Amino acid sequence: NATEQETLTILLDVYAYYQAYQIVKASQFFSDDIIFLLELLKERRELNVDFLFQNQVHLQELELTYHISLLDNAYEEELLANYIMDLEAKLRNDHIIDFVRSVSPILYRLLMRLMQSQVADINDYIYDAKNDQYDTWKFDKMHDSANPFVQNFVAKGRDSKITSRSLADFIQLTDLPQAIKDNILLLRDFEKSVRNPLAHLIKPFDEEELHRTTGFSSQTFLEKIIQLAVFSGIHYDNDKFYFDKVNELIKRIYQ
Template sequence: MNQTILFTPVGGTDPISLNNYHDGSILHICRFYKPDKVILYMSKEMLDFQEKDDRYRYCLDRLAKMQDRPMIYEIIERRELTKVHEFDYFYEDFRKVISHIYETMDDSDTLLLNVSSGTPAMKSGLLVLQTLGEFPAKVIQVATPVGKLNEQVHEGYDVETLWELDEDNQEGAQNRCKEIQCPTLSKIKKEEIIKKHILVYDYQAALDVADSLPAEQTVQYRDLIYQAARRVLLDFVNVDKTIQKTNFQCLPVRYSSQRKYFEYALTIDIRLKRGEYVDFIRSITPIVVDLFEMILKKQCGIIVDDYCDQYKRAGQWKRMWSAKKLNGTEVGKVLNSHYQKMEKRFEAKDVYSEHLKILTDHFSSDTRLKQLMEDLRNVESNIRNLAAHEIVSVTDETIKNLTGFYGRDIMSKIKELFGYTEISIRKGYWDSYDEMNRKILEQMSNE
């Protein structure tokens, strides 16, 4: 219907102030917002005035005629209402009345609420309803022409004379209306929940809550949360797209061939910070294999792919050691010799961290590097299978008892191993998720 509807209590300075000859709040809102319908909520005292001289409808009729437009009125009578200071009454009654108004509206209609007319209890009742966020509306406040409280004078009220004297009827009269933004209790609560999810790196949960709010309320920060949610999933295609929108570069390692390893390591760190120890342990093996391989290349000049064949499994390309490519090479001799000493046979199958460690032990002279690789290899073998194949509680103490290291110690070794690869990482890079969180929270504060 595309209608504008004004719901308003009627106050002591409506429709025109006898004290200063200016519009009261109701008339002033109608003057500048031009509602199609005005719903007047009247206590016993205001009904008495209305029945005495029809002052409210008289002034609204004169305004409608002046503006050459139709305007209809509805009066909600509360003749029994004499205790106009009781907040509880108005909150409950306004809730019922406005709920009924909404039943008559469609999505194209606009509701205006006047919070400048009526008693303090009436104004508070409307503001609390808006804070609860049940009924979307424009909340209008009207400043007094003198910049301070109006005095209410009723003796000798001549509505026809006051209309002629009303200074707001003059061309160029000042618009004293102001739309006030009432952050709803629901919005405040949801944004606090969003912040808590962000601080524990649960970006998908934060995004789900953000998407339950109107889009215009999250425009400052929603894309940043989405960017974080895709980042933690290592979805670099969508991360790169969102960076173009947010203009916030969250990835400290930019080269596509390197960033996946570093970003994966950051997700391991997040699992540790969140106390997700089972997922933390399960996620160690892939990064250990990748780190060992990069280290073997950087420190020893050995490229593992040179000794492997490719094969397809479940629609994905995999690799395995190639007996043919290893034959006659130093790499093949080292691997075969190691297993022969243990009275075992080296099988040219999938590439495991154990194989890469054997090669590094042989070709590198760096004792610190060897110790780090030994520690992480032991962690992987001692606890990974337990977490992967058994229903078991894994805590930080469990990790310490089985490996000799707490989770933070393991993560520290992973970080140190990166220093042996060709990926250039500054110390501050490891805090990039916290930096991203600060950016999101800053944008939420800047709404």
């Protein structure tokens, strides 16, 4: 017996933008701006950044109207920023298992992005295999490299597959700040200790078990992922959650 507006509020607080969209879209008592804002947030949590740029004109209209930013990055950077928002949302809803499984794709992309900052032509040292198979290092081409970090990588006699693990090791040989390397070393241990087992195994898992296993809270891992992203040139607000900011905007409209 809760009102349409009361239900909207609650869903916002748990970032249930799909459900919040269903309600507002199906009523008459809401602005066109709210349903567009909730369509935007919903498509964000479906990892649809293309929506933001396809409707960039209407997006800039609302930005001018309410004096708020809804898009802080160019397409490539926004892809990664948006994904981390979804990551923080799952964490705030205490979906720890979901959070953990979501770490792998963004970790790989950040690792690749950071390496390109250290070796610009890193694509040339990569054999692109078919979609299922892992890409492989061209160790033979890497010996001829003028890049000092690349040369350090070959001598070990590592295996060819390009995993997040091998990329993590590659980072350690670069001139990136130790804080960046430390975060990556810690996220690499994260992958082995909690992420990889949670793929074939069905085990009880929560925040307390995550902290017990790794020695750190989930918030620490999230913030370290953010620090990697921010250092790589991606803007992410770590003191003011994007979803919370937009939720407050939507609330001030119907309240």
